[PDB]
């Protein structure tokens, strides 16, 4: 019965609360998408836009939760960009070993950080332990892999640069999300091991049935998503 514009009208408050709490670039992109929904002419157009809001907003709240920078997809660095700027002395041999798999160079994770446009973090190991802790405490599916040349041991007498590669998501099939993510990045990790480059890859996911205290984002942010985008999806179907 209800037209789409009227659906957006009814959820004015929830969406105004959502936009107010997202990081600035993330909020703007969601606001544009919301007006695409408001002015949508086809049900397929609205749903696709809602899908974009779901993923973009979730990433904004993942960033806030972790005190990380939200990066719009257009500004997200690729793997090749990370090797170029963080491990320049190995970039040429990175190119050679990617000749049979050149799409590796263009892999663009949600977050691509390095230890102190690649973002900097204070400790990679702390993030990994955070993820492994919540996986072990709350049963949350993750996948994790670290590169390792041969059977090399960690060392105490020198520091090396390292990368942390994180994939996040908001979607129903949580197990499938992390299984497919780690599978996609497995070849890169093996490659990194052969280059002597230390990397960790992390993947995790939430869905709308995850207990509110158990998400990878702060519970306050869970309510904002459920009160806005999640109802929007409900209301798009009914009407």
């Amino acid at each position, epitope marked *: 019965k209800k037209p789409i514009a009227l659906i957006c009208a009814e959820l004015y408050k929830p969406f105004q609360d959502l936009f107010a709490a997202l990081p600035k670039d993330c909020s703007e992109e969601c606001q544009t998408l919301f007006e695409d929904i408001r002015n949508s002419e086809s049900h397929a157009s609205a749903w696709s836009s809602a899908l974009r809001i779901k993923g973009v907003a979730y990433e904004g709240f993942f960033s806030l939760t972790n005190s990380w920078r939200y990066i719009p997809e257009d500004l997200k660095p690729t793997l090749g960009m990370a090797i170029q700027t963080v491990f320049p002395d190995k970039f040429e041999k990175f190119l050679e070993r990617t000749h049979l798999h050149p799409e590796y160079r263009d892999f663009t994770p949600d977050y691509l950080m390095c230890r102190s446009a690649v973002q900097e973090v204070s400790s990679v190991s702390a993030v990994v332990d955070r993820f492994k802790s919540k996986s072990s405490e709350k049963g949350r599916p993750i996948r994790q892999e670290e590169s390792r*040349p041969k*059977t090399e*041991s960690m060392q*105490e*007498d020198i520091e*090396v640069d390292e990368l942390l590669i994180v994939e996040v998501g908001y979607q129903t099939d949580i197990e499938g999300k992390v299984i497919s993510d780690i599978e996609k990045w497995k070849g890169v990790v093996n490659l990194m091991s052969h280059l*002597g480059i230390k990397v960790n890859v992390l993947t995790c996911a939430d869905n709308s049935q995850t207990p509110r205290t158990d998400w990878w984002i702060d519970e306050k942010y869970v309510r904002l998503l459920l009160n806005s985008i999640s109802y929007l999806f409900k209301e798009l179907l009914e009407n």
Partner: antibody
Amino acid sequence: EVKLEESGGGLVRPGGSRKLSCAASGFTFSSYGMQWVRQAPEKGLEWVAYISSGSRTIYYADTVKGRFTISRDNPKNTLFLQMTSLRSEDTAMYYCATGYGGTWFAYWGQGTLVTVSA
Amino acid sequence: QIVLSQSPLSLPVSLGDQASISCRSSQSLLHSNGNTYLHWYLQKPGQSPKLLIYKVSNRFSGVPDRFSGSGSGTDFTLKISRVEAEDLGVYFCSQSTHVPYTFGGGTKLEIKR
């Protein structure tokens, strides 16, 4: 003066358990990885286990995997080795050691003798 | 699971002569961080082992300067320029580039008489 002092050795029946301790002094224990090394009588040295400064990274010799647990208590400047399912082949002098800045064995205890026998 | 092969097994040497002990690795001990974790120890009779040389050629603080180390990759050598009576004992190389950490089998230095 850096010193490592092991305790807890003695006699255990096969299949049994024993916990060793190593008390460290003379350096900031909590900043450094710690290790166990053993030596069966009249034989060579055999590395046992490694634990990083903050317990994040642990390594074991394949012959002790699933049986021994290495751990530490940094406020108490103590390193531990929990041994279980002991076999006659585990009879040895057990040393704790550290690199005090590396994975080499720069400092060694006097050792504590574990005899596994009925 | 690097195998370290020491040679010779036993080394008789006259006081004041030089001694040379070889340690061969089954794979390279060059770590991706650029260091080579091959180390040398002496166990005197009835005593606990003692570090002589770490990372191929760094003499541990306080170790007599008659001890030196050299090598690269898979081939390493411990030298005693002038053997003293107190050098009696068993010499071990060991590696910590790879897990498990492994030891050579020991070289027994014997004082000739």
